[PDB]
């Protein structure tokens with residue numbers, strides 16, 4: 001991108017639109033590191049990951065608003081399948 | 092006391108059934124009541140209860156006592172809808188005389204059986220019974236006979252589904268044998284004629300309740316139950332999903348539902364599934380999941396006769412049945428157990444106008460005295476018969492092996508098939524190169540040199556295709572597109588057959 005924020009935002013978007021299924025991949029780790037406040041500011045050392053994840057990688061941690069969005073999306077998608085299940089060709 | 096007060100008092104008792112203390116025990120054991128199960132199964136508010144005020148008329152052995160007068164007489168019957176589609180249900184209530192069958196009990200079930208046949212709607216039974224009610228004696232035996240007569244009459248007319256939600260003993264254990272699918276609940280449901288008490292008394296054998304007739308036995312070893320589910324809530328959730336596959340009656344075409352999965356997409360993942368080396372197995376399920384709409388597949392008997400895969404799926408919205416081999420198990424060979432499961436599935440789908448898709452990869456039959464003495468010949472004829480007599484669209488794709496008589500058993504084109512596709516890895520022959528060449532050139536010199544020439548000419552799908560056995564040889568990635576095209580034009584197919592009172596299956 002033209003600047004540091006544009007390239008990072010575009011990377012975040014590419015990772016969420018990148019479909020890998022059949023194996024275990026490391027997208028969750030890449031998606032969280034690039035959005036880390038130290039990475040965006042640039043306070044990165046060669047041992048960065050060892051201090052951020054001293055007990056291992058745990059996955060993306062949700063905040064209050066993100067949990068509400070995840071619950072709303074999962075609930076709306078659940079209902080969308082329940083409604084599709086009722087649309088038959090008329091007998 | 093007014094009549095309205097008496098009516099209200101009967102309504103309250105009918106809802107409690109066997110009483111609150113029994114209901115409390117019902118939950119302690121981890122079971123739902125008969126009415127709670129229906130509320131989960133059917134669309135909210137759609138259920139209408141029939142004959143809620145019927146009571147038994149037996150007066151002998153103290154049955155005339157007020158303490159025995161349970162409105163509903165141990166069954167909840169009525170009608171409703173699942174996703175807007177009409178279905179009839181009944182559920183046996185274990186808290187009232189142990190769920191035992193009375194004369195009036197059967198009568199109510201028969202009533203539902205008759206309305207469903209007349210209109211053309213499926214019947215779903217939730218069975219849980221301790222057997223015949225001995226206080227009435229022979230009245231309950233007539234009850235079973237009348238139910239059996241309806242279950243036979245309804246065969247091929249309306250789907251019949253039986254979900255077992257508890258123990259089942261005596262004559263009751265035969266109704267799931269007449270219906271089309273039997274499902275169970277793990278560690279909760281049982282199917283047996285006599286209990287362990289009789290086995291110990293008759294013969295010197297030691298067995299417990301789970302070993303004799305538990306859900307794990309019937310879904311893994313005897314081949315009686317089509318699938319067991321972990322608990323009551325999950326069992327009914329999957330039952331609603333299963334229901335959505337089937338037509339309401341055999342007079343109806345396979346249901347077609349809204350579908351977002353483009354019918355003309357390719358599946359590149361198929362081109363490399365089948366190894367070039369003949370001794371390397373692969374998972375047939377990977378092919379099935381990639382072809383079917385949105386990768387949804389409903390597998391039947393996942394733990395029984397694993398060498399053959401049968402189940403339900405949709406393609407372009409239309410329900411289809413899928414049958415295929417599993418090369419991972421017993422090299423993909425046919426045996427007694429696989430023929431029984433296959434023939435039963437094929438026949439149901441034909442009766443209710445559900446197209447068949449066949450994925451062939453079968454090297455022959457399982458050899459050995461275990462199968463010879465078991466009647467492998469008599470049993471293999473069941474699958475050949477089920478395909479040969481089918482009148483619904485049949486689309487066969489051969490993914491790799493098809494040796495010997497198994498070629499024709501697995502729905503070959505000459506059994507009135509509609510289309511037959513081969514992948515480039517398919518090989519159709521009476522037997523493999525080793526057997527065929529050593530037999531043809533028996534006692535000759537330089538057999539291995541002759542084998543090299545034989546393999547180059549015959550170890551491929553071409554000597555069959557050039558004779559009209561195969562309609563095309565397709566890149567595997569296009570399989571879904573080809574099948575979708577055939578299904579949407581064979582759906583209007585009609586054929587005639589000579590009249591016969593009934594079919595005569597080899598048994």
Ligand SMILES: CC(=O)SCCNC(=O)CCNC(=O)[C@H](O)C(C)(C)COP(=O)(O)OP(=O)(O)OC[C@H]1O[C@@H](n2cnc3c(N)ncnc32)[C@H](O)[C@@H]1OP(=O)(O)O
Pocket residue numbers: 188189190191220221222223224225258260261262284
């Ligand atoms: C040969 C043939 O095919 S005919 C078979 C005849 N079948 C029967 O009569 C039932 C078989 N034997 C039994 O009764 C067994 O106990 C079974 C099959 C009901 C299973 O027993 P369980 O699941 O443990 O239920 P259990 O018998 O403990 O239930 C007890 C209650 O149910 C009722 N009950 C149990 N068995 C029967 C029965 N055979 N008939 C009528 N009511 C029964 C009792 O009223 C008893 O009352 P309670 O609430 O005060 O205890």
Ligand SMILES: *C(=O)CCCC[C@@H]1SC[C@@H]2NC(=O)N[C@@H]21
Pocket residue numbers: 422424454455456457458494495522
């Ligand atoms: C080697 O011993 C040859 C084994 C036979 C190959 C398989 S096993 C069962 C099927 N029957 C048959 O003739 N071929 C198949």
